């Protein structure tokens, strides 16, 4: 009991020249009243110093180390938006966790999340994620937000049949074939994809195969083509008598998956050399 207040005061005294005093006050109130909710939102905390706490609010801080949360096995809801958390293996034993929010954290390695197969909602919007392989194990998710990342391979999502809300806008998605089986979807977002092809040699008669495919595998007909190019399936064609550094084309197609209807929109950019 006394060791808890001692550790909290020692943590507060180590604040750099951050509202650690308010954090200590809230910790004392939660420990005294045996509260199940701990709200430490927007305290600028750069570090961290309760068996009944089930919801932990930590949005709006500067946390990089989440080791002090490793033994909070009663946690059901954990919010860590706008932090700087990069390692997630510290949550491997939070087997009661149902909801997890890690938006605006700049995270690229989400492999540790393979240790939370019971998760029901997962928010990873606005990060640096490319590989979502381990997400294939989270077969109990009904909400998954992956918007504003660098994801190009969404095949790991093909078996997550329980999904009802899926946010995939602002990524590098060009192939929706992996989503064809998610017939339980209610909300789906797929707009503003940015696809970058490998650089190819410039030609006066430039021919670029279209690679944008819908959920049926059919090529998406481009909506706009730069440099007066045209489309004759499967090829986008340009006449470039003078060299230019890049061409591009923008696509926009309505897609229906389950009970969800979404605009699959984006832009493919083709760099040219020589």
Author numbering: 8 to 24, 28 to 59, 64 to 288
Provide text from the study.
Here, we have demonstrated that small thermally stable protein scaffolds that accurately mimic the structure and specific conformation of two HCV neutralization epitopes in complex with a human bnAb can induce nAbs in the context of a murine and a human antibody repertoire.
Epitope I (residues 412 to 423) is a prime example of such a structural flexibility, as epitope peptides comprising this segment have been crystallized in complex with nAb fragments in three distinct conformations. Superposition of AP33 and HCV1 Fab complexes onto the designed E2_S3_3T1 structure revealed steric hindrance of Fab AP33 but not Fab HCV1 with juxtaposed loops. The steric clashes are caused by a variation in the angle of approach of the two Fabs to the epitope, which differs by 22° between HCV1 and AP33 (51).
